[PDB]
Design a protein around this ligand. Structure first.
Ligand SMILES: CC(=O)N[C@@H]1[C@@H](O)[C@H](O[C@@H]2O[C@H](CO)[C@@H](O[C@@H]3O[C@H](CO)[C@@H](O[C@@H]4O[C@H](CO)[C@@H](O)[C@H](O)[C@H]4NC(C)=O)[C@H](O)[C@H]3NC(C)=O)[C@H](O)[C@H]2NC(C)=O)[C@@H](CO)O[C@H]1O
Ligand code: AES
Length: 137
C-alpha cells in the first residue's frame, strides 16, 4: 500500500512540471518531505486508504480539482503515479493562490501559507489566517 519513488525521479518530474504550470519547485521541495516517508534515496508514499500520494489528497479534494477542468487521472490511479500526483499538488496550489490573493490583498502567498491551505483546505485556512493564528516575523 505504498509506492516508493527515488529522489532523482521526483526531482526531474518536479523540475518539468513546476515549469509547465508555474508553481515554484521549492514549494514541492518543502511539501513532499513533510507529507511522506523519507527514506535513503527517496520517498515512500501511502496509496491506500483515505489520504494518498505525494500530496496526501483525499478523494473529495482530488475530485474537486477534476471538477475545475484539470486533466487528472482518477484518484486511485493518479495518486499512485508520480506525474499526476505532482500536477495535483500544483493545481491545488494555483487555486489556493487565487483564493488567498482575493482574501488577503497586498500580501504574499508564501510556501508556508500555501501549505496551510493544502493541509487545512482553503475554507479553514482562510479562517485560521483571519483569526490571527499565524505568527509572522
Ligand atoms: C485531523 C487533521 O488535521 N486531518 C488532516 C486532514 O484534515 C487533511 O485533509 C484536508 O482536509 C480538509 C478538511 O476536510 C480538506 O479541506 C477541503 O479543502 C478543499 C480545497 O481547498 C475545499 O474544496 C474547495 O472549496 C472551494 C470553496 O467551496 C471551492 O471553490 C474549490 O473549488 C474547492 N477545491 C477543491 C480542489 O475541491 C473543501 O471545501 C475543503 N473541505 C472542507 C470540509 O473544509 C483538504 O482539502 C484536505 N487536504 C487534502 C490535501 O486533501 C489531511 C491532508 O493531508 O491531513 C490530515 O492531518
Ligand atoms: N489580523 C490578522 C491580519 C493578517 C491576516 C493575514 C496575514 S497573512 O496572510 O500574511 C497577515 C495578517
Amino acid at each position: 500500500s505504498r509506492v516508493r519513488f527515488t529522489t532523482a525521479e521526483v526531482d526531474s518530474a518536479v523540475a518539468r512540471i513546476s515549469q509547465k504550470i508555474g508553481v515554484p519547485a521549492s514549494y514541492y521541495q518543502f511539501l513532499i518531505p513533510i507529507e511522506n516517508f523519507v527514506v535513503a534515496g527517496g520517498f515512500e508514499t501511502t496509496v491506500s486508504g483515505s489520504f494518498r500520494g505525494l500530496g496526501q489528497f483525499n478523494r473529495q479534494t482530488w475530485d474537486g480539482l477534476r471538477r475545475l477542468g484539470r486533466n487528472l487521472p482518477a484518484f486511485e490511479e493518479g495518486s499512485a503515479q508520480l506525474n499526476a500526483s505532482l500536477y495535483a499538488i500544483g493545481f491545488l496550489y494555483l487555486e489556493n493562490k487565487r483564493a488567498y490573493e482575493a482574501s488577503f490583498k497586498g500580501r504574499v502567498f508564501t510556501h508556508e501559507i500555501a501549505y496551510l491551505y493544502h493541509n487545512q483546505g482553503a475554507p479553514a485556512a482562510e479562517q485560521y489566517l483571519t483569526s490571527g493564528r499565524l505568527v509572522y516575523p
